[model samples]
Target: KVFGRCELAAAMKRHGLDNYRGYSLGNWVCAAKFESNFNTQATNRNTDGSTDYGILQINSRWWCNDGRTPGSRNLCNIPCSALLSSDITASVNCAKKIVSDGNGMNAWVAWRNRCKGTDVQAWIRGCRL
Candidate 1:
């Protein structure tokens, strides 16, 4: 599923991403934009052979168990395929844990490259909360 901007915003909010770990819905919205273009099944494989999965692009190297990532910690204890599901609950919860574990939003390059240190509110402007 590829979410519309506002729909993704509302979904993230419902999943407790608004103001979560000091990051706003705009931050999440912005990251999701670059991460997966709002597509739930988006996936990318890194040079190291680690795959990133889903809208948040959660990496297999340290998060999901993709069976190809070297030393995959499986920190999320979830299958990488789960992140690609139409139901984003697993992805959302794993993302929350990533930031809450002191990673901040830096774990997602999308945030650093496109959303960090900005009033990302404009990203979600005019969207119904």
Candidate 2:
């Protein structure tokens, strides 16, 4: 269902997110629904007449407040074109942060709720190697 499994896995590994990759995958799928309805290349237009890009089609130009290097400066929605283009992991990890947020999947609660206690694989398939 996802378009970037290998890249996503690599991203997970790079970010030390693999330990929770299983749960992260589900959180990601749910986030896709929450962020852009599973549309890997999804984009959206703001009422202000601006446009975003890719599934999570992050209006990076505005939301990427974390600065291009994650320090000093930041944007509202990090531009997800490249990150989501060849590697859905960027998007997946972002969603994971929102999921296991100390608050407990507050961002993914809606989707997570429906998947709670369910078989991890049956509920949300893991990334194939």
Candidate 3:
């Protein structure tokens, strides 16, 4: 399922992403828009034999084990398939693990390109928290 902007914000907030690792919920939401367009089943594969799964879309090169990517660390220690669920708990928590590992939200290219070094409040401006 694809989530609406506000709905994504609220779901992420409920997972405690607001101000997490010094990033606001808007930052997360803004990147999520570009990463997967709020689609739970979204997937993008890299030329390096890595796959990004779900909304947070952390790739298999480091976070999750897809049993294909070389040097996959599976830092989140969860199945890549779990990320595609609408429940979002596994993926969101996995992203939190990435951030807690000192990667921050910049781990996602969408955030670096679109949401970094700027106030992304517009992504959440109309959304009621």
Candidate 4:
């Protein structure tokens, strides 16, 4: 399921992720926008054969397991399918833990290549959250 920007912002705010781990809501919003276009079930294959899953497109090489992907660190200790849910609870929790590990938003190429240094205030512009 893809979330409307306002709906996502509201949910993130409610989850206390608006400023978690020193990352702004804009950072998360923009990253999610570019990474998965807000689609919770989004998945992409990397050149190294690892796949990214979920709204944040978390990598199987480090965060979650696809069962078929051998030797995954699975640092988030979650099934990749867990991140594919519209609920987003598991995905948000995992993202917080990942950022707490010091990677911050830098773990996402979308953040670095697209969201970083961009003024993303518009992402939550009309949201009351």
Candidate 5:
């Protein structure tokens, strides 16, 4: 209920992933289900006491600033809470950045290879997202 079609579409477009054929909304949801169980505000704590945050679990050391949280230490450098709260597009695009360096779908290649032709990979491949 939080997002309608236009919001989601705009979010995808901002990330330059307007190509729904490869990153379909359904498939995106699938990816989230498999990885983080649809928890956009998800977080994973590492053995070294570090943390990855958000749906894609972006490392906290990359993108936070005073605008979001004032005078606090940020790891991946991005305040995930702020990114997510500030805009869905910000959060999704950040996740896409971690997923795709530039090619956008190369991450799909990695995902497919990891799955080794399993049903999940097939499912992903079959998706027109």
Candidate 6:
């Protein structure tokens, strides 16, 4: 499991996510917390028989291949396993593409359910980033 909001924030900034597409770092941080609790290896099997992968909870239905899932669009052209790494470069790139495709943060249900309209600053509170 990963730790430290400062580290996450720093890495996200280095990836140029601090203010991506009008979404704040706080929005990303809050979504990450609710989606995977910042665990890179996080995975959850959905009721629809799809699975979400990595900290961003990217879905196999559109983004990556887990091999077990049939008919995955695999738009990222990388295995879902790549996103499970502590190194977040691939995942961030994929997420950026997803967002750029007009999905925005709406791609993450956790963001809609938990982060929307919330005071997002709390997600990075005291991180000292």
Q: For model 1, how does the per-residue alpha-carbon lDDT over 1-129 read when each residue is reduced to its tens digit?
A: 989999999989998999997888899999999999999999998998888999999999888898777777999999999999988899999998899877699988879988898889998999988
Compose the digit string of candidate 6's lDDT tens values, residues 100-129: 997689878989999989999787778766
Looking at model 6, which ten-residue stretch has the lowest summed lDDT? Answer: 1-10
**Regions more than 4 Å wrong, model 2:** 1-24, 33-37, 45-53, 56-77, 96-101, 109-120, 124-129
Question: Model 1, poorest ten-residue lDDT window?
Answer: 63-72
What would the per-residue lDDT of candidate 2 be over residues 108-127, giving only the tens digit for each residue? Answer: 44455655565434324554
- Cα displacement (angstroms), candidate 6, residue 57, comes to 0.6
Q: Write the per-residue lDDT of candidate 3 for residues 24-73, one digit (tens) a residue.
A: 88898988899999998999889888999999887998888888897778
The Cα local distance difference test for each model comes to: 0.91, 0.48, 0.88, 0.87, 0.48, 0.86
Top-down TM-score ranking: 1, 4, 3, 6, 5, 2
**Model 4 vs. true fold: TM:** 0.94
The TM-score of predicted model 5 comes to 0.49
Worst 10 residues of 3 by lDDT: 99-108
* Model 3, residue 17: C-alpha shift (Å): 0.6
lDDT comparison, 2 vs 4, better candidate:
4
List of clashing residue pairs for candidate 3? none
TM-score on alpha carbons, each prediction: 0.95, 0.45, 0.94, 0.94, 0.49, 0.93
Model 5 C-alpha lDDT versus the unseen true structure: 0.48
Global fold similarity of model 2 (TM-score): 0.45
In model 1, what is the error at residue 16, expressed in angstroms?
Answer: 0.6
* Deviation in Å, model 5, residue 5 alpha carbon: 12
Q: lDDT: which candidate is best?
A: 1
For candidate 5, write residues 4-118 as lDDT tens digits.
Answer: 3344444545566544435644445444444454455666655644555554445544444434333445533455665545255666756555555555543543334443234
Total backbone collisions, model 4: 0
Candidate 4 Cα misplacement greater than 4 A, ranges: none
